[PDB]
Design a protein that fits this description.
The PDB classes it as transcription. This is part of a larger assembly, with chains A, B, C, D and E. By secondary structure, chain D is mainly α. Chain D is built from 3 helices and no strands. By secondary structure, chain E is an alpha+beta fold. The relative contact order of chain E is 0.11. Classes of the chains: A mainly alpha, B mainly alpha, C mainly alpha, D mainly alpha, E alpha+beta. Chains A and D meet through helix 4 of A and helix 1 and helix 3 of D.
Chain lengths: ~140, ~70, ~100, ~60, ~90
């Protein structure tokens, strides 16, 4: 259903709201009308390493099979998790980079429009001059 | 090998962020400036078009006063 | 979890407007439209579209759908019937873009 | 007479090119540039708030 | 980031700008277009052999209004406007 606060939104309370704002600026339904407050190089050098280790574990997992394999698969799990950590470090950085790209594109577009109209105007002027050079 | 080519093909990342933020701000400034330049160019082109218009009404007045 | 807060209650209620069938259930009523209370509440819930209240909105649709309904309550069954077909056309594309 | 006709044709073509150049180009773009400047001035809220919009299924 | 700028600008304008019925529920520049139509007609009319009783005319905003007197409480005046010229 709908929240209970809706029962405090009558036209009379809306008529009493401005003076309650001016009075409170200097507990009730009019407080229900007031909105609530707001609550209170890099990793690329390691990724390679991790990658190189992953294969090295896979070989082990191949070379075991016996009941020893279990122990090995544990280590493998840890490696994969590490990979995920570094990618987490790539989540916000790439976002900012994307913003950069967008802005640059905007700049280029801006100049392109003007350039188009410019060349058109030039052509027009030349054409008229030609006609002039044929009469006198 | 595809993973190696991809991690070597990623853009140049940095350990700090002041570089990226600085780039963003600069790009904003360039956006404003190039917008203004666009405005000026549009104005000039408008003026020229007004002139060659003027020429055309001259011609029209000519032929109008002519043939009839 | 402990007792809720009016901020989270109004937040979850305005975020519930992103669902199409829920808005359909809210509009296909007969009691909440006899008195000018639910309309004034929906028009009151427009503070989430402005910062810093917009920093907690997870679904961008619920806000704009709210602005549509607040845009429609100013000026019965038929139009209420009219909106969901169109929104239905819109949904799946965004769903494809999400995941 | 023939010469005069030729000149008239030339003038007509010039006029047409003019009308095209007028239809190519003005204050609406300036207003959209002003509103765009009002929209650029913040990115810090979008770089930290837009990251939570990628993980989200519609509410049920 | 597009949707972030959209919620910054209150709403999500791609939804109404892409939806049809939702868009169904959600001056000086035009004046100059009429004057450009008389410049095209005035040169072709200017070249042709206009008859003698039609040499007098008044180019009105987007038309050519020419008169010749008669009776019936009015004056034999007409408004002309076209488009082709080739």
């Amino acid at each position: 259903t709908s929240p209970s606060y809706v029962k405090f939104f009558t036209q009379s309370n809306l008529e009493k709201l401005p003076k309650y704002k001016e009075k409170k600026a200097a507990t009730c339904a009019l407080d229900y009308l007031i909105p609530p407050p707001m609550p209170k190089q890099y990793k690329i050098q390691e990724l390679r390493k991790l990658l190189k280790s992953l294969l090295l574990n896979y070989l082990e997992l191949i070379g075991v099979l016996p009941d020893m394999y279990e122990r090995k698969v544990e280590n493998i799990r840890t490696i994969l998790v590490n990979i995920h950590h570094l990618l987490n470090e790539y989540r916000p950085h790439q976002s900012r980079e994307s913003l950069i790209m967008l802005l640059e594109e905007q700049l280029e577009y801006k100049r392109g429009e003007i350039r188009e109209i410019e060349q058109v105007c030039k052509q027009v002027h030349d054409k008229l001059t030609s006609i002039q050079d044929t009469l006198r | 090998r595809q993973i190696n080519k991809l991690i070597d093909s990623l853009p140049g990342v940095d350990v700090s962020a002041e570089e990226q933020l600085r780039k963003i701000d600069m790009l904003q400034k360039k956006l404003v400036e190039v917008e203004d330049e666009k405005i000026e160019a549009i104005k000039k082109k408008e003026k020229l078009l007004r002139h060659v218009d003027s020429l055309i009404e001259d011609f029209v007045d000519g032929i109008a006063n002519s043939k009839k | 979890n402990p007792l809720p807060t009016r901020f989270e209650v109004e937040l979850e209620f305005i975020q519930s407007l992103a669902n199409i069938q829920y808005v359909t259930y809210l509009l296909t009523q007969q009691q909440i439209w006899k008195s000018p209370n639910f309309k004034n509440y929906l028009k009151y819930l427009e503070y989430w579209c402005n910062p810093p209240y917009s920093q907690c909105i997870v679904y961008p649709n619920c806000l704009f759908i709210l602005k549509l309904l607040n845009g429609f309550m100013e000026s019965x069954x038929x139009x209420x019937x009219x909106x969901x077909x169109x929104x239905x056309x819109x949904x799946x594309x965004x769903x494809x873009x999400x995941x | 007479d023939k010469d005069s006709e030729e000149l008239d044709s030339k003038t007509r073509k010039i006029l047409e090119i003019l009308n095209e150049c007028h239809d190519e180009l003005x204050x609406x773009x300036x207003x959209x540039x002003x509103x765009x400047x009002x929209x650029x001035x913040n990115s810090t809220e979008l770089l930290d708030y837009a990251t939570k919009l990628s993980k989200f299924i519609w509410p049920a | 980031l597009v949707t972030a700028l959209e919620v910054l600008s209150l709403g999500r304008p791609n939804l109404p700008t892409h939806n049809f019925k939702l868009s169904g529920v959600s001056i000086g520049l035009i004046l100059q277009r009429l004057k450009d139509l008389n410049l095209t007609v005035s040169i072709k009319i200017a070249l042709m052999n206009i008859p003698k009783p039609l040499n007098s005319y008044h180019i009105k905003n987007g038309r050519i209004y020419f008169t010749v007197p008669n009776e019936f409480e009015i004056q034999l005046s007409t408004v002309n406007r076209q488009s082709p010229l080739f």
